[PDB]
Amino acid sequence: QPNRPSYCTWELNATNSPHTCRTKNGDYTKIMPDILTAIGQTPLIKLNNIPKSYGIKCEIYAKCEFLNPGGSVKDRIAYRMIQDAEDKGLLKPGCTIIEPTSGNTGIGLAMAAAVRGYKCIIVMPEKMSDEKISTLYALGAKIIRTPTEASWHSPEAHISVAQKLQKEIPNSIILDQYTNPGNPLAHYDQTAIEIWKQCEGKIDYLVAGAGTGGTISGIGRKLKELSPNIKIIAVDPKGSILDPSSDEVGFYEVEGIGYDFIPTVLDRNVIDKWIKTEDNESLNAARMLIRQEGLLCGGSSGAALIAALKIAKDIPEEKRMVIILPDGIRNYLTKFVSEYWMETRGFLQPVCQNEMNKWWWNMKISNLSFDKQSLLKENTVTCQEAMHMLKNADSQLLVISDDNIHIKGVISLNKLTSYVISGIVKCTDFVDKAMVKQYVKVKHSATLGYISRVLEKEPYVIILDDEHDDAFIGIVNQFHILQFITKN
Ligand code: HEM
Ligand SMILES: *Cc1c(COP(=O)(O)O)cnc(C)c1O
């Protein structure tokens, strides 16, 4: 159980500790034996334009963890845990490392396992995040998929099934970044020390986001031991219970911060204040870091920046603040880096490039007229019949609904062909097995410029009725847009 209470007896400035102490990971001045020894020693860069544009009088330095060789801060822990395991004899050559995370920790453990010749197996359902799949497959990791709906309570969830797979595979191990002292200890021993030395002893506030609390708790313990007056600020997104002030749990786009449980490695006694963030301000702040500061970073970095800017309004000029930037743009290239993805989610407004289009740009989809496709029921149509229908369909998609009103899922030719070839779906089986539960849905009241912008990637868009119970209306493609534009 990752949510169990911690048994750690540490108190401030305590001497004798059972844990290992790793000061430095390697020496850049001479030849390094492996890429893992290059983890850490990341630069602390000043923010120049962003704080002065926001009227902040004090100094703000970003510790860049996207410059680690794996691309994230998680390298630090992925090494450390493994290291400690190897000193306990738990890790042998030929061992298989299993971790229940879809985040950057899987990439760190995949890289370290590649260096050490360990098999690596990562468990994540569906796609929560993508472009990390290519990186994990490139590093030699096996990826196991589960149902994405199952809560971490459910056995179908990635954690429980990760333990089941651990029991199935002989002589395997789970490092469990949530319960592992190596996670906070890596930042206690190294990250916090690097920040302390680089600041030359002058540091006042430290802002970081906590997914697992490892970073903020390790740096909080070490820095609070070195500088008792330091203020440690944690950043949690809306929809996560990590904040001691909470209440339900929501859905946010920003990856890497917040959880629906309270990890063991997170020590909330060293957290002075919690700041809550939203996807919009966070992601636009990350784009702001990239644009104004030339720092290529992820969304959690933007969340850190927004929290720090909220706190720093009244902070006097002589103080220094340090914020942690956990990872880089690599994973997010198609999500918050893309203007299309930003305008789709509503985080940016689509701009009308040609003034000729100005008349139909703000018109609603309601002015359009398109077919309302019959909603098929559950467990009726065989795939043969659905091959026929998809061939004959206007927009070449099928709609499956149990309620006859709201659309439960969709059927596409690509998913169907994938499942038929892989053997998951026999020809005479039911198409509901190949159903796609995630899909693009747009309110009936949206403007035609938004729809035309979304259609540049998605060939189809499901229109739902915002006034009555998100009721299914019809499917819209670029044919309807051209037909509305040209015939005026
Ligand atoms: C003098 C310093 C410290 C002492 C005396 C101490 C004591 C302990 C002990 C005895 C355990 C064993 C838990 C068990 O047997 O179930 C433990 C676990 C742990 N320690 Fe420490 N510790 C110290 C420093 C630290 C530091 C600096 C960190 C993080 C930066 C840390 C993080 C943890 C964590 C996350 C656990 C896991 C708790 C669990 O497994 O339930 N400790 N600690
Ligand atoms: C893990 C992670 C965090 C949070 O780091 P913690 O050690 O969980 O406090 C923030 N951003 C990203 C991208 C992460 O992977």
XYZ file of C-alpha atoms and ligand atoms in Angstrom:
546
model
C 0.000 0.000 0.000
C 1.540 3.300 -1.136
C -0.857 5.305 1.072
C 0.256 3.708 4.356
C 1.637 6.054 7.038
C 5.389 6.514 7.205
C 7.449 4.830 9.922
C 10.411 7.180 9.395
C 11.692 8.442 12.752
C 13.685 11.357 11.284
C 13.493 14.702 13.046
C 15.222 17.973 12.233
C 19.038 17.838 12.503
C 19.138 14.169 13.546
C 22.533 12.450 13.385
C 22.535 8.654 13.109
C 20.467 7.430 10.154
C 19.874 3.914 8.778
C 19.733 5.144 5.169
C 22.635 5.368 2.745
C 24.220 8.723 1.857
C 25.188 9.522 -1.748
C 26.935 12.881 -2.081
C 27.995 13.062 -5.757
C 26.973 10.940 -8.759
C 30.075 11.467 -10.904
C 32.860 13.719 -12.137
C 32.323 15.670 -15.364
C 35.971 16.772 -15.526
C 37.182 13.319 -16.630
C 35.802 10.344 -18.529
C 32.589 8.988 -16.913
C 32.014 5.205 -16.899
C 28.308 5.345 -17.822
C 25.482 7.768 -18.549
C 23.980 7.168 -15.089
C 26.961 8.851 -13.422
C 25.982 11.994 -15.373
C 22.617 12.284 -13.595
C 22.365 15.442 -11.520
C 24.563 18.531 -11.299
C 21.929 20.525 -13.145
C 22.290 24.294 -13.610
C 20.411 26.889 -11.582
C 19.367 29.573 -14.078
C 18.032 33.035 -13.298
C 14.623 34.154 -14.520
C 15.104 37.584 -16.105
C 12.082 38.711 -18.142
C 9.212 36.771 -16.545
C 9.354 38.090 -12.935
C 9.948 41.723 -13.921
C 7.039 41.523 -16.370
C 4.893 40.417 -13.415
C 6.313 43.169 -11.198
C 8.152 40.817 -8.834
C 10.885 42.642 -6.923
C 12.809 39.622 -5.604
C 14.941 37.062 -7.449
C 13.612 33.826 -8.960
C 15.982 31.018 -9.973
C 14.799 27.883 -11.764
C 16.635 24.626 -11.128
C 16.485 22.856 -14.480
C 15.927 19.119 -14.092
C 15.034 18.661 -17.766
C 18.785 18.626 -18.482
C 19.298 15.212 -16.867
C 20.381 12.517 -19.358
C 16.997 10.776 -19.211
C 15.165 14.062 -19.694
C 13.529 14.460 -16.277
C 14.211 14.719 -12.562
C 13.117 11.102 -12.038
C 16.541 9.900 -13.229
C 17.883 10.926 -9.815
C 15.564 8.532 -8.027
C 15.648 5.771 -10.664
C 19.401 5.527 -10.188
C 19.238 5.931 -6.410
C 16.635 3.257 -5.687
C 18.437 0.803 -7.974
C 21.745 1.662 -6.310
C 20.362 1.022 -2.838
C 18.716 -2.196 -4.022
C 22.060 -3.357 -5.413
C 23.714 -2.671 -2.061
C 21.037 -4.779 -0.348
C 21.627 -7.638 -2.797
C 18.030 -7.436 -4.029
C 19.109 -6.690 -7.619
C 20.970 -9.425 -9.512
C 22.001 -9.625 -13.174
C 19.034 -10.822 -15.195
C 16.509 -9.364 -12.749
C 13.337 -7.809 -14.139
C 12.421 -4.390 -12.744
C 8.681 -3.654 -12.670
C 7.356 -0.211 -11.858
C 3.741 0.945 -11.739
C 4.155 4.407 -13.288
C 3.415 5.946 -16.679
C 5.476 9.034 -15.844
C 9.147 9.833 -16.194
C 10.177 7.333 -13.505
C 9.556 4.569 -16.032
C 11.973 6.255 -18.429
C 14.605 6.649 -15.724
C 14.330 3.012 -14.673
C 14.298 1.934 -18.328
C 17.536 3.833 -18.990
C 19.263 2.591 -15.829
C 18.106 -0.962 -16.573
C 19.500 -0.601 -20.095
C 22.880 0.376 -18.647
C 22.845 -2.386 -16.005
C 21.435 -5.080 -18.302
C 18.181 -5.466 -16.378
C 14.888 -6.362 -17.994
C 12.361 -3.547 -17.614
C 8.564 -3.844 -17.536
C 6.261 -0.825 -17.192
C 2.502 -0.992 -16.581
C 0.195 1.806 -17.715
C -3.387 1.657 -19.019
C -4.534 2.996 -22.389
C -2.809 6.268 -23.214
C -2.640 8.752 -20.365
C 0.446 10.217 -22.041
C 2.070 9.510 -25.391
C 5.442 9.948 -27.128
C 6.741 8.316 -23.955
C 5.699 4.980 -25.471
C 8.258 5.428 -28.254
C 10.959 6.302 -25.711
C 10.171 3.285 -23.518
C 10.139 0.913 -26.494
C 13.445 2.412 -27.651
C 15.026 1.750 -24.235
C 14.073 -1.939 -24.304
C 11.198 -1.774 -21.814
C 8.145 -4.010 -22.041
C 4.854 -2.133 -21.683
C 1.784 -3.861 -20.228
C -1.636 -2.234 -20.583
C -4.608 -2.436 -18.221
C -8.135 -0.973 -18.020
C -7.862 2.792 -17.614
C -11.162 3.026 -15.713
C -10.084 0.929 -12.721
C -9.271 2.980 -9.647
C -6.035 2.148 -7.854
C -8.286 0.298 -5.397
C -9.419 -2.020 -8.200
C -7.279 -5.078 -9.029
C -7.477 -4.176 -12.736
C -5.420 -1.069 -11.893
C -1.759 -0.847 -12.863
C -0.429 -1.062 -9.289
C -2.254 -4.240 -8.255
C -1.607 -5.913 -11.608
C 2.020 -4.809 -11.261
C 2.230 -6.774 -8.020
C 0.477 -9.746 -9.654
C 2.976 -9.682 -12.523
C 5.752 -9.430 -9.931
C 4.492 -12.634 -8.307
C 4.244 -14.316 -11.720
C 7.770 -13.364 -12.844
C 10.427 -15.151 -10.752
C 13.189 -13.106 -9.109
C 11.695 -9.751 -10.074
C 11.431 -6.569 -7.997
C 9.228 -3.482 -7.623
C 11.035 -0.363 -6.416
C 7.785 1.506 -5.597
C 8.718 5.175 -5.818
C 5.877 5.977 -3.400
C 7.205 3.963 -0.425
C 10.917 3.963 -1.304
C 13.243 6.108 0.862
C 15.512 6.421 -2.176
C 13.029 8.786 -3.829
C 13.193 11.591 -1.208
C 16.756 10.642 -0.229
C 18.107 11.353 -3.719
C 16.941 14.968 -3.477
C 17.914 15.201 0.196
C 21.485 14.080 -0.530
C 22.102 15.718 -3.929
C 19.444 18.080 -5.347
C 19.162 20.129 -2.147
C 22.951 20.200 -1.756
C 23.430 21.372 -5.351
C 20.868 24.133 -4.803
C 22.504 25.135 -1.508
C 26.017 25.376 -2.966
C 24.877 27.124 -6.155
C 22.970 29.706 -4.100
C 26.128 30.177 -1.983
C 24.045 29.765 1.154
C 21.460 32.457 0.342
C 18.034 30.963 -0.346
C 14.654 31.950 1.086
C 11.727 30.193 -0.629
C 11.707 26.893 -2.525
C 8.713 26.121 -4.757
C 8.131 22.677 -6.260
C 5.198 20.504 -7.245
C 4.574 17.181 -5.523
C 3.310 14.190 -7.365
C 4.910 11.817 -4.862
C 6.236 14.526 -2.556
C 9.721 13.062 -2.995
C 11.400 16.196 -4.352
C 9.728 18.702 -2.032
C 10.199 16.489 1.044
C 13.861 15.637 0.463
C 14.857 19.184 -0.445
C 12.611 20.407 2.370
C 14.302 18.231 4.989
C 17.866 18.995 3.885
C 17.310 22.709 3.252
C 15.333 23.141 6.476
C 18.252 21.488 8.283
C 20.775 23.848 6.662
C 18.644 27.032 6.718
C 15.876 26.918 9.351
C 14.120 30.071 8.088
C 13.596 28.682 4.572
C 9.970 28.470 3.435
C 9.026 25.303 1.541
C 6.055 25.665 -0.823
C 4.312 22.711 -2.470
C 2.276 22.970 -5.680
C -0.749 20.707 -6.139
C -3.243 20.853 -9.029
C -6.978 21.134 -8.588
C -8.388 17.625 -8.411
C -5.732 16.105 -6.127
C -5.996 15.427 -2.390
C -2.299 15.976 -1.587
C -3.199 19.384 -0.152
C -4.269 18.986 3.506
C -7.072 21.369 2.479
C -9.113 19.446 -0.092
C -12.856 19.115 0.523
C -13.872 15.881 -5.195
C -11.049 14.632 -7.420
C -11.112 15.999 -10.961
C -9.340 15.472 -14.270
C -6.442 17.748 -15.217
C -4.150 17.762 -18.247
C -0.928 18.664 -16.405
C 1.173 15.543 -15.883
C 3.437 14.610 -12.986
C 1.890 16.396 -9.983
C -0.865 15.229 -7.629
C -2.387 11.869 -6.742
C -5.647 10.475 -5.386
C -3.803 9.025 -2.365
C -1.160 10.360 0.028
C 2.273 8.801 -0.646
C 4.477 7.550 2.160
C 7.535 9.496 0.992
C 5.684 12.820 1.254
C 6.408 14.526 4.585
C 3.889 17.328 5.078
C 5.559 18.625 8.251
C 8.263 20.329 6.159
C 5.705 21.951 3.825
C 5.066 25.540 4.890
C 2.307 26.327 2.372
C 0.375 24.672 -0.455
C -0.615 26.481 -3.665
C -3.342 25.152 -5.970
C -3.025 25.470 -9.748
C -5.204 25.106 -12.843
C -4.340 23.659 -16.243
C -4.781 26.960 -18.097
C -2.453 29.130 -16.006
C 0.067 26.296 -15.644
C 0.400 25.395 -19.326
C 0.372 29.005 -20.506
C 3.065 29.661 -17.900
C 5.144 26.789 -19.293
C 4.814 28.231 -22.792
C 5.802 31.513 -21.124
C 8.982 29.920 -19.757
C 9.840 28.545 -23.201
C 9.139 31.817 -25.003
C 10.523 34.429 -22.623
C 13.224 32.498 -20.726
C 14.293 30.109 -23.497
C 13.836 27.159 -21.112
C 12.374 24.033 -22.713
C 10.266 22.447 -19.987
C 6.985 20.729 -19.176
C 3.645 21.687 -17.706
C 4.540 20.979 -14.075
C 7.267 23.591 -14.532
C 4.582 26.097 -15.499
C 2.574 25.160 -12.409
C 5.646 25.840 -10.261
C 6.126 29.207 -11.967
C 2.509 30.272 -11.395
C 2.639 29.293 -7.721
C 5.896 31.199 -7.239
C 4.545 34.299 -9.000
C 1.438 34.193 -6.804
C 3.568 34.084 -3.657
C 6.267 36.551 -4.745
C 4.081 39.666 -5.135
C 4.985 41.177 -1.748
C 8.347 39.416 -1.244
C 11.081 42.043 -0.677
C 13.843 42.662 -3.187
C 16.750 41.086 -1.278
C 15.137 37.631 -0.978
C 15.859 34.718 -3.317
C 13.326 32.140 -4.489
C 14.088 28.820 -6.196
C 11.587 26.798 -8.233
C 12.079 23.281 -9.604
C 11.436 22.517 -13.276
C 10.885 18.740 -13.352
C 11.102 17.833 -17.055
C 11.322 19.087 -20.623
C 9.186 19.534 -23.720
C 10.050 16.137 -25.218
C 6.997 14.303 -23.896
C 4.646 17.248 -24.469
C 5.602 18.119 -28.077
C 2.104 17.283 -29.322
C 0.187 18.459 -26.265
C 0.887 21.793 -24.606
C 3.622 22.773 -27.067
C 1.179 22.457 -29.978
C -1.008 25.501 -30.570
C -3.644 23.173 -32.056
C -3.886 21.135 -28.842
C -4.035 24.340 -26.779
C -6.837 25.858 -28.862
C -8.734 22.553 -28.787
C -8.780 22.352 -24.982
C -9.799 26.015 -24.781
C -6.465 27.124 -23.317
C -5.940 29.356 -26.371
C -8.348 31.077 -28.685
C -8.203 30.122 -32.383
C -7.270 33.187 -34.430
C -8.938 33.860 -37.782
C -6.133 34.294 -40.301
C -8.103 35.392 -43.379
C -10.590 38.233 -42.950
C -12.777 36.762 -45.712
C -13.726 34.099 -43.149
C -14.751 36.733 -40.569
C -18.466 36.234 -41.270
C -18.738 32.496 -40.509
C -16.014 32.386 -37.837
C -18.189 33.108 -34.788
C -21.330 31.424 -36.152
C -22.471 28.420 -34.123
C -22.565 24.834 -35.365
C -26.344 25.160 -34.940
C -26.503 27.073 -38.234
C -25.037 23.985 -39.907
C -27.254 21.049 -40.851
C -25.919 17.493 -40.921
C -27.121 13.916 -40.607
C -28.088 12.492 -37.231
C -26.755 8.949 -37.430
C -28.775 6.164 -35.844
C -27.256 5.085 -32.535
C -26.650 1.337 -32.530
C -27.418 -0.617 -29.380
C -25.019 -2.701 -27.303
C -24.120 -6.210 -28.475
C -26.087 -6.281 -31.723
C -24.010 -5.613 -34.835
C -21.424 -8.174 -35.910
C -18.191 -6.873 -37.422
C -19.130 -8.105 -40.908
C -22.255 -5.943 -40.756
C -20.157 -3.101 -39.329
C -17.639 -3.431 -42.150
C -20.612 -3.002 -44.491
C -21.991 -0.010 -42.564
C -18.605 1.688 -42.179
C -18.160 1.342 -45.937
C -21.578 2.933 -46.494
C -21.369 5.467 -43.645
C -21.383 9.175 -44.465
C -18.562 10.144 -42.075
C -17.207 6.555 -41.792
C -17.747 6.147 -38.055
C -20.243 4.175 -35.991
C -22.061 5.236 -32.828
C -22.914 2.885 -29.951
C -25.297 3.977 -27.197
C -26.972 2.054 -24.388
C -29.391 4.896 -23.545
C -30.573 5.655 -27.133
C -29.669 9.307 -26.417
C -26.093 9.704 -25.162
C -23.240 8.203 -27.180
C -21.319 5.534 -25.264
C -18.642 4.790 -27.854
C -17.537 4.931 -31.475
C -16.363 2.411 -34.073
C -13.551 3.317 -36.473
C -12.083 1.285 -39.318
C -8.561 1.543 -37.886
C -9.420 0.193 -34.429
C -11.611 -2.531 -35.936
C -8.899 -3.649 -38.365
C -6.323 -3.616 -35.559
C -8.457 -5.850 -33.335
C -9.456 -8.172 -36.193
C -5.828 -8.646 -37.254
C -4.487 -9.067 -33.710
C -7.187 -11.691 -33.071
C -8.924 -9.793 -30.254
C -12.109 -9.650 -32.351
C -13.346 -12.507 -34.522
C -15.272 -11.708 -37.704
C -18.592 -12.879 -36.235
C -17.900 -11.319 -32.828
C -19.541 -8.082 -31.663
C -18.111 -4.680 -32.563
C -18.436 -3.463 -28.965
C -15.094 -5.174 -28.258
C -13.414 -2.801 -30.752
C -15.360 0.209 -29.428
C -13.358 3.384 -28.747
C -14.475 4.961 -25.464
C -12.369 8.115 -25.945
C -13.204 10.459 -28.828
C -13.578 14.127 -29.708
C -16.890 15.710 -28.689
C -17.897 19.346 -29.181
C -20.860 21.303 -27.828
C -23.564 22.270 -30.312
C -23.005 25.954 -29.422
C -19.344 26.055 -30.476
C -18.228 28.412 -33.228
C -17.422 27.193 -36.731
C -13.878 28.547 -36.448
C -13.233 26.283 -33.471
C -14.669 23.308 -35.372
C -12.685 24.079 -38.525
C -9.549 24.365 -36.384
C -10.182 21.014 -34.667
C -10.921 19.323 -38.018
C -7.368 19.943 -39.270
C -6.330 16.887 -37.219
C -9.466 14.919 -36.307
C -11.371 13.935 -39.480
C -14.620 13.558 -37.503
C -16.135 15.469 -34.586
C -19.075 14.281 -32.482
C -21.598 17.055 -31.793
C -23.414 16.878 -28.458
C -26.362 18.986 -27.313
C -25.214 21.201 -24.455
C -28.745 22.226 -23.492
C -30.268 18.738 -23.144
C -28.075 16.236 -21.284
C -25.166 16.210 -23.792
C -27.528 14.424 -26.180
C -26.119 13.025 -29.411
C -26.823 15.231 -32.440
C -24.584 14.160 -35.316
C -21.082 13.842 -36.723
C -19.368 16.779 -38.454
C -16.474 16.574 -40.928
C -14.718 18.988 -43.272
C -17.331 18.257 -45.956
C -19.940 20.154 -43.931
C -17.520 23.047 -43.373
C -16.706 23.371 -47.080
C -20.412 23.014 -47.886
C -21.258 25.875 -45.522
C -18.416 28.149 -46.668
C -18.753 27.808 -50.440
C -22.549 27.835 -50.757
C -22.794 30.775 -48.280
C 18.578 10.587 11.289
C 17.794 10.542 10.207
C 16.748 9.431 9.928
C 16.289 8.453 10.734
C 16.655 8.156 12.206
C 15.324 7.673 9.984
C 14.615 6.582 10.439
C 13.934 5.690 9.638
C 13.686 4.288 9.912
C 14.141 3.517 11.171
C 12.999 3.773 8.887
C 12.534 2.300 8.792
C 11.029 2.213 8.557
C 10.546 0.808 8.804
O 11.326 -0.007 9.361
O 9.379 0.504 8.443
C 12.779 4.836 7.918
C 12.116 4.750 6.711
C 11.950 5.784 5.816
N 12.721 6.931 5.775
Fe 13.932 7.597 7.288
N 15.235 8.209 8.716
C 16.096 9.284 8.642
C 16.284 10.078 7.530
C 15.449 10.122 6.433
C 15.472 11.108 5.368
C 16.479 12.282 5.317
C 14.492 10.798 4.494
C 14.063 11.502 3.178
C 14.647 12.590 2.664
C 13.826 9.606 4.988
C 12.763 8.961 4.386
C 12.254 7.731 4.749
C 11.142 7.041 4.127
C 10.315 7.567 2.937
C 10.954 5.882 4.766
C 9.876 4.830 4.425
C 8.878 4.679 5.569
C 8.182 3.350 5.426
O 8.693 2.488 4.664
O 7.124 3.146 6.075
N 14.434 9.225 6.167
N 13.367 5.985 8.413
C 7.309 13.069 -10.485
C 7.103 14.409 -11.190
C 6.841 15.542 -10.485
C 6.741 15.520 -8.961
O 7.949 15.118 -8.387
P 7.876 14.462 -6.900
O 9.144 13.714 -6.568
O 6.695 13.521 -7.122
O 7.556 15.504 -5.854
C 6.653 16.740 -11.151
N 6.726 16.787 -12.499
C 6.991 15.665 -13.199
C 7.074 15.727 -14.719
C 7.179 14.461 -12.542
O 7.447 13.296 -13.273
